[PDB]
Amino acid sequence: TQHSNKVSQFHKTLKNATGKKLLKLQKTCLKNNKIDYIKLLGEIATENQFEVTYVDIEEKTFSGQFQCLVQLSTLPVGVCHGSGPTAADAQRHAAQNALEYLKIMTKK
Amino acid sequence: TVFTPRDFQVELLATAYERNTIICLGHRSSKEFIALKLLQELSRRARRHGRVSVYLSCEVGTSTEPCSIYTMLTHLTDLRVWQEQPDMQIPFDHCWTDYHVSILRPEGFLYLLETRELLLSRVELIVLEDCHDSAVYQRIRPLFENHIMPAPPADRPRILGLAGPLHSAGCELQQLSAMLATLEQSVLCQIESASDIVTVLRYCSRPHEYIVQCAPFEMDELSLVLADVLNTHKSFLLDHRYDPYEIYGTDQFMDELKDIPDPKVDPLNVINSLLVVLHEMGPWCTQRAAHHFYQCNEKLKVKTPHERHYLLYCLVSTALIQLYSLCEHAFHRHLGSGSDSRQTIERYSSPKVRRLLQTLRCFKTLCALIYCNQNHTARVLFELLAEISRRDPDLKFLRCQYTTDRVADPTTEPKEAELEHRRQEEVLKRFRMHDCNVLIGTSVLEEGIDVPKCNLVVRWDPPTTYRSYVQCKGRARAAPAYHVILVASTTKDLVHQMAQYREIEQMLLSKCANTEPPEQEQCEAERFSACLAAYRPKPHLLTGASVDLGSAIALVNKYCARLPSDTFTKLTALWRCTRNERAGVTLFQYTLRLPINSPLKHDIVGLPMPTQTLARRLAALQACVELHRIGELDDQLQPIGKEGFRALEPDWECFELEPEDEPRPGTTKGAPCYLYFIQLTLQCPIPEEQNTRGRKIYPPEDAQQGFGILTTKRIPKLSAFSIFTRSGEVKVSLELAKERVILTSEQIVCINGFLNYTFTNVLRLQKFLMLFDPDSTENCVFIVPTVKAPAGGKHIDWQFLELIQANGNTMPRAVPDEERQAQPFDPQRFQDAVVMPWYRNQDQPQYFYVAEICPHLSPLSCFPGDNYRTFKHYYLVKYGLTIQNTSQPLLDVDHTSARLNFLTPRYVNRKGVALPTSSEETKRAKRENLEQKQILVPELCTVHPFPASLWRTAVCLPCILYRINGLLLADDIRKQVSADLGLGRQQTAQEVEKRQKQLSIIQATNANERQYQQTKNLLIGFNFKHEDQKEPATIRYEESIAKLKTEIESGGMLVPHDSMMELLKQLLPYVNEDVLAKKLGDRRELLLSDLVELNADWVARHEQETYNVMGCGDSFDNYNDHHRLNLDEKQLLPAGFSFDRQPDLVGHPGPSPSIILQALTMSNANDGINLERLETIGDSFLKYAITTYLYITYENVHEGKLSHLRSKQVANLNLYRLGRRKRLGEYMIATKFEPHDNWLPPQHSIPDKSIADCVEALIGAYLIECGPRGALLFMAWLGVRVLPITRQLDGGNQEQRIPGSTKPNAENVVTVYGAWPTPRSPLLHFAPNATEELDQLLSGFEEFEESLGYKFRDRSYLLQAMTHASYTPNRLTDCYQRLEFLGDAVLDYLITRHLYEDPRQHSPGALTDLRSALVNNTIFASLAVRHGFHKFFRHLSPGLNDVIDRFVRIQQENGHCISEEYYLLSEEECEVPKALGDVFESIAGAIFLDSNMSLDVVWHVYSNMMSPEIEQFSNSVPKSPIRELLELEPETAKFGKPEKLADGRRVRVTVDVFCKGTFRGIGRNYRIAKCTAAKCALRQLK
């Protein structure tokens, strides 16, 4: 029952922030390709006192796309992921996944 | 709130006993029990005819370990047992003749029969364990096919097959028909269905088996969003490549890389569970299951040290937080102001959940039982009903609870397993009293654990086994039973499943040995039960309890459930079916017999009546008639309990409370009188090394003066003894004077003044503050001084009395200086005199004997010291006095002893060194004050008129007049018993703990783990098909299933998306109706006696009757109705430690009053002795007195209420009453003897239980010198009725008075308490060959007789004593629980007076501990195991199988022996079995009466095998640290009840010590807190 309180605690601590870029991320349709996700997600990392880890998996897909998972060192922690044939596109996909994921926790 | 008890584990055993039978059961414990006790029952016939009981299985021959079958058989089947090992050479010599039960393979028994050493005529019982396996079937195919049906049916041993519950098999039903038919054809037995399944099928109302279809799920935006993010997570997880050679890539971890687990398996299981819950139940249930999986996964993060597992589990927890966010936002999307979250669950729920809610709403007392196959579904379902009941006022009246199948492994996590088991017991407790009507179970609640009667069972999952389906069907036991199965295009599959399972019910329930009454037959019973009047023992009373035909079977069931029993003794009525053809009409007849625990052992015979249920109702009607005719059922028809039983009134008046009684009461809180001389002669002086004083030994016999006793009453002669002063051991004799002295008043006054001077100023044994008066009605004993005559005698020293009278105020006074100047010295004056000082202590002087005159010592001589040079200088410095004449020699003195008691019979001479030489507490102070050596000066000291030798004779009399005032009450008790009796004339340790734990854990292993393997094979196997072919009955399956299909679509099972003469004539179709009109007449009913008269006339008019046999009804009746079957179905020894040495009641002087006064002196005063030596045996007499008497007054009354009678008569309140009516209370001494305060020279508050502590001790007073028998007459003096009463008049026998005759009354009645009548044999003779059967039951008991050392004159009490409570075949006598009941008290005396009479002389605490260690059920169990009495006894109970199985696993791993209960000793004295303990005790009843009340015979027989271990307990006697802590504070240190703290996790235990305080200790559990409290008490006290 302590982890129900931990789920509620994580929901509250990621719905308690009042940053402008988080409000912009919730407002902006993140399916748009004009938004950088790597640089914006690094800015969000520097803003929200956690550290983004781009753990780049050495094992690619069976179809041949390089894989990389990101870690958002919050309390509790979060892990997102992405894939793509080059490192930049896969990291952009993983950052977009983590940014829409934060768009879930910034939804009120 | 009650249930009708059915014959479970009774019809199975009866059908397994009568005909060749096949039993299919779930647990492997119950099948092995039924096989084991069937071997036990058939071994009675295997013993006489020289036959072999066999056990065929596949677990045999696997290892040299004793498998479960061998160890269970060598404990419980109290027989000779052998099991084949895989690699033995099979000795053919005597292993099949010297072993009752042999456990062989089918191949092993086949090859044994092939060698023709053992024949098929020489085997009695064949039992085939798990023969439904196809491998076992092919094993036993040649065994049957070549030997068994070629053998004649007269040469056939009885065949019982065991099978797994093959009904649960997932094959087609034509395969099941081929199974039943082929296995009946091969194994040659009827298949009796025989399980919990079929008793809950037959004997409970079969539910309407409902299918409820549910619609497929509709989706909304939240549902596709959740499914999309989880499908993305499965895309990543199945996309993720796992390889130990890629994550790590180390070649030196080749065996270690395999042990690293896959970090995707738990994500796959978790999100697959969430995916199927999204698919079938809904996003609400999925969010709850995701919350549960987060609660699991955050701990699963903590457990792992690997990195990739950690980031993947963090990713899964990330996904769970995502799902919680979407679902909580969507539920808060609809959570407006006043919006109903009930409807928010309603819209998002799947139609499966809403259809379950409709099933719940159709049930507006409820008992709902909902199953599932997964635990997390159970938890989320529980939370659905909780959130619904907290939001829906319609379902607000619903209380629900869930239970999971998560019994953890105890070898890894035992504490969490204990938590889950405690939680399980708690919720089963909260469910079984109907606090919460809705329970959600899992597969663990299908078998094993029972539930009460339910009215609705809902299966969420349609099961793959029939055992789960029909157990769910059976759990709805109440009459409105509804078996709802939910499904969500699967309607056709569920319809096929229902038709298949109802087909299994059809060919399983009808394939029985008992069957049901059909519904039209039930309606026939309804119209038939009104044809007879209600049997009433009180027909005049309108509101009397009545027995009709219909409720009679329920009353007989309740009477059979009401007999006293444990959890595993199970007693049921036994009715047997017989059809009789009469005038061409088939009229079934029902016989009925009660169990043996009820004394009605004879069969009760019904009459033939045309239907089954009416004949059963007549059997129950005549059974209730015979029940009230004997007296087991009262007028109110309630069967007799232990509390409600009342014995005969001549034994009930002792329980009446006293008027004072009716701390709680009764709880633990001039005449020539007799003259005698006291002659003292030294016989053993003090040794020279023991004489620390270094002085001359003074015997008392050199003294010219001694003492004499002058008594008005006659002094009886007593045994000689000695006195042990500082001088040594002195023999004491009481010399009788040859002449009688007259009395004079002035000499009486002088003698009384001498006594006052002796008791106040000489011996000081009459201390002050009290008064004295030398004229008492109670005795007139005087003590006189005498001087030895020159002729050799002793004459009264009247001159000494005159000197004492003239010197009554002798005190040390200041002698003047002129008188000391004029004082000379005489050595004869100071030869053997007593000196006191007058320079110091004038008010309280000290008295010293004269030891040595020293002419070399003088006042001019040197004082022993440098501060005082001379004695004169010492005196003039310390006291300022001048010694006048200093030329005289000094004086050596000897101090008096500081201890008054000197006898304590025959242990003071070695107790002189115990405490420092009479304990000398003033010696150290006076040697510090007066500088060690007490060399005195005779002119400055005074001389007493009392001589020093007479003083040494006078100090050995401590107890003088309080002794005489006390030792008349005991002689008065002696006079009363001699008046009413005839005898007597009227005028390391941690290593030990860890070894015990490892042996217990590794040796249990035949316990609930077998229940967990049953739980494993519950929903997994359902296997072992044999053969199926194209037979035409397959088409007989296909139509009927379709017919069953047309039931389900039409019976409401599938729910879519929406004249009294006429009944008397039919009552007796073979009886003419004009006779019935003659008997009826003005009346309106036919009585039972009318039916007896009609059947008696039919037997008279038609003398040839017939019988036929069917049913599950037992052949355990036999004899009374069967075996003969000749046309009757209408009506009925050294003298050491010798108990038996009763001395003669003619010519005996009777008891000495010293032993009675020992019974009157307690341990509270503790004046050398105590009552606890006698009462420790005395309490054990009362049972041995009362119970044996209660064996003879109520011979046909069972022990379950005689135990209540014994507990009422042996009770401490009862002995309080019995001691108070004799008014003994002023007779004990409960005050400390001390003359200042509580002695009157010529009261005591006494506790309740302490009065009892005298009274039982009183019979101990008559234990030895009176023997037992006249001791019985002492409770005839009490009124404890133990001996039979004969009422007579004055016989006038001048030879002697009758031993036990009382005083005559006003009607001159004379009561004689004669001998105990010898009991009748319990061998009832309803059959004319009960002696022949008793001879036919016990072949091998001569080995039992040579093992003990006793040969029985009669096997009647032995055969009863060898017979279980639930052993209904042994119908001749009762069970072994009536010879337990008196044998325990008889062996309790044998052990107790063995422990009391031995010359080691243990303490009262030591004797109590030796009793409580030497008497328990475990020690009789131990000597039962060790000396081979796992070889003779008979038994019939279910779980005794596994209990006593694991018991001899414990014993034989240890090697029988003792040490486990020798640890249980002080590990529990500071109950795994019962029966085999009391088995060894049960024979102690039989030899109590086979030897005709000879305790010496029993002890002599059992001594040769008891002697080394009672010697070992006589090596373990000398005291204990726990016994230390209980001799300091036995009652004072009391450990209080624990109290919970505010944290709710800690427990505090407070121990209170009186006059010291309360000490509290805290701890996590109760034992640690109690230990902390004990350590705090030890730290404050020690």
UniProtKB/Swiss-Prot annotation, chain A:
Changing F62A: Strong reduction in Dcr-1 activity. It is found in: Cytoplasm; Cytoplasm, Cytosol. Residues 36-104 form the DRBM domain. Residues 35-106 are annotated as: Sufficent for binding to Dcr-1. Disulfide bonds: none annotated. Disruption phenotype: Larval lethal and displays miRNA processing defects. Embryos do not develop past the first instar larvae stage. Most females contain ovaries with empty germaria accompanied by one or two terminal stage egg chambers. Accumulates pre-miRNAs and displays a reduction in mature miRNAs. Residues 1-108 are annotated as: Necessary for interaction with Dcr-1. Homodimer. RNA-binding DRBM domains 1 and 2 bind dsRNA while DRBM 3 binds Dcr-1. The RNA-binding DRBM 1 and 2 domains are able to bind dsRNA independently. The DRBM domains appears to bind to the RNA duplex and then slide along the siRNA helix to the ends of the siRNA. The DRBMs display a preference for binding to the more thermodynamically stable ends of the siRNA which is enhanced by interaction with Dcr-2. This suggests that the domains may also function to pre-orientate the guide strand prior to loading into the (AGO2)-containing RNA-induced silencing complex (siRISC). The name 'Loquacious' refers to the mutants being 'very talkative' as they display a loss of several types of gene silencing. This is Protein Loquacious.
UniProtKB/Swiss-Prot annotation, chain B:
Residues 1517-1582 form the DRBM domain. Residues 365-488 form the Helicase C-terminal domain. One of its GO terms (biological process) is miRNA processing. It comes from the Eukaryota. Changing D1384A: Cleaves the 3' (bottom) strand but not the 5' (top) strand of pre-miRNA. Residues 1-741 are annotated as: Necessary for processing certain pre-miRNas, such as pre-let 7 and pre-bantam. Keywords: ATP-binding, Cytoplasm, Endonuclease, Helicase, Hydrolase, Magnesium, Manganese, Metal-binding, Nuclease, Nucleotide-binding, Phosphoprotein, Repeat, RNA-binding, RNA-mediated gene silencing. Residues 1-488 are annotated as: Important for interaction with loqs isoform PB (loqs-PB). Activity towards pre-miRNAs is not inhibited by inorganic phosphate. Residues 1-359, 369-479 are annotated as: Essential for miRNA substrate recognition. It is found in: Cytoplasm; Cytoplasm, Cytosol. Its EC number is 3.1.26.3. Residues 552-647 form the Dicer dsRNA-binding fold domain. GO terms for molecular function: ATP binding; deoxyribonuclease I activity; helicase activity; metal ion binding; pre-miRNA binding; ribonuclease III activity; RNA binding; RNA endonuclease activity. Changing D1179A: Cleaves the 5' (top) strand but not the 3' (bottom) strand of pre-miRNA. SMART domains: HELICc, PAZ, RIBOc. Gene3D superfamilies: 3.30.160.20, Dicer dimerisation domain, P-loop containing nucleotide triphosphate hydrolases, paz domain, Ribonuclease III domain. Mg(2+) 1 binds at E1175, D1253, E1256. The helicase domain is essential for substrate discrimination. Probably identifies authentic miRNA substrates, by binding to the miRNA characteristic single-stranded terminal loop, checking the loop size, and measuring the distance between the terminal loop and the 3' overhanging (3'ovr) termini which is bound by the PAZ domain. The PAZ domain is important for substrate discrimination as it recognizes and binds the characteristic two-nucleotide, 3' overhanging (3'ovr) termini of pre-miRNA substrates prior to cleavage. The PAZ and platform domains form a binding pocket that binds the 5' terminal nucleotide of the pre-miRNA. This is Endoribonuclease Dcr-1. It comes from Drosophila melanogaster.
